[PDB]
Write a protein that binds this ligand. Structure first.
Ligand SMILES: N#Cc1cccc(-c2c[nH]c(=O)c(O)c2)c1
Ligand SMILES: [Mn+2]
Ligand SMILES: [Mn+2]
Ligand SMILES: [Mn+2]
Length: 200
């Protein structure tokens, strides 16, 4: 088949808000989306996974964790997750320090991706084109002292999470895996996958 551009794929297959946040992140990282295009797609994918991980999850009027897949959650419901990824540096740390000084949860040394108000911990989300256990170790070694819970997804459906604690129900994680499969399949149809996979 014809070779598409990764740029075209990103703009056509991710929500514009995700794309914009990804562009802003790369600018902050000092990287040009039009040159580091595999990176651009990876950043969009990881941001989307962070959003999907948080989607629909609330803590109810009684303080238990519930899933509300409707458009209207009751106004007394609080979001279960704080989302850290996607914020600029200053705002991301502002949100972290707030959570920390508020919950007593110690300050992480690197920005994590989410905070889970049910499990009372930060989460680092990983998305990898390689085997989950290798990527897991890489994340953990960067994290060192671990308060922060790690959850890794691969494009082929494997997962690895700290202490075999996967946080979410199967259906939620299935949504994420289905989305990753869709991304891979679409990339493949445009002949972008092999390089995207190899570039990690
Ligand atoms: N530059 C760059 C780049 C490329 C691919 C992925 C990421 C990334 C960002 N945040 C994360 O939390 C993460 O787990 C990965 C960053
Ligand atoms: Mn980031
Ligand atoms: Mn992050
Ligand atoms: Mn992450």
């Amino acid at each position: 088949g014809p070779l598409g551009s990764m740029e075209d794929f990103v703009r056509q297959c991710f929500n514009p808000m995700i794309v914009e946040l990804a562009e802003k992140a790369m600018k902050e990282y000092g990287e040009d989306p039009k040159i580091e295009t595999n990176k651009f797609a990876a950043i969009c994918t990881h941001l989307e996974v962070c959003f999907m991980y948080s989607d629909f999850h609330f803590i109810d009027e009684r303080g238990e964790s519930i899933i509300v897949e409707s458009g209207d959650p009751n106004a007394l419901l609080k979001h279960r997750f704080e989302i850290i990824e996607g914020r600029d540096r200053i705002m991301a740390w502002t949100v972290v320090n707030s959570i920390c000084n508020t919950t007593g949860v110690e300050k992480p040394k690197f920005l994590p991706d989410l905070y889970d108000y049910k499990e009372n911990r930060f989460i680092e989300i990983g998305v990898t084109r390689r085997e989950v256990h290798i990527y897991y170790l890489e994340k953990a070694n960067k994290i060192k002292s671990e308060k922060t819970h790690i959850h890794i997804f691969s494009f082929t459906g494997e997962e690895m999470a700290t202490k075999a604690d996967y946080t979410l129900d199967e259906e939620s994680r299935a949504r994420i895996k289905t989305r990753l499969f869709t991304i891979r399949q679409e990339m493949a149809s445009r002949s972008l996958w092999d390089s995207f996979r190899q570039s990690e």
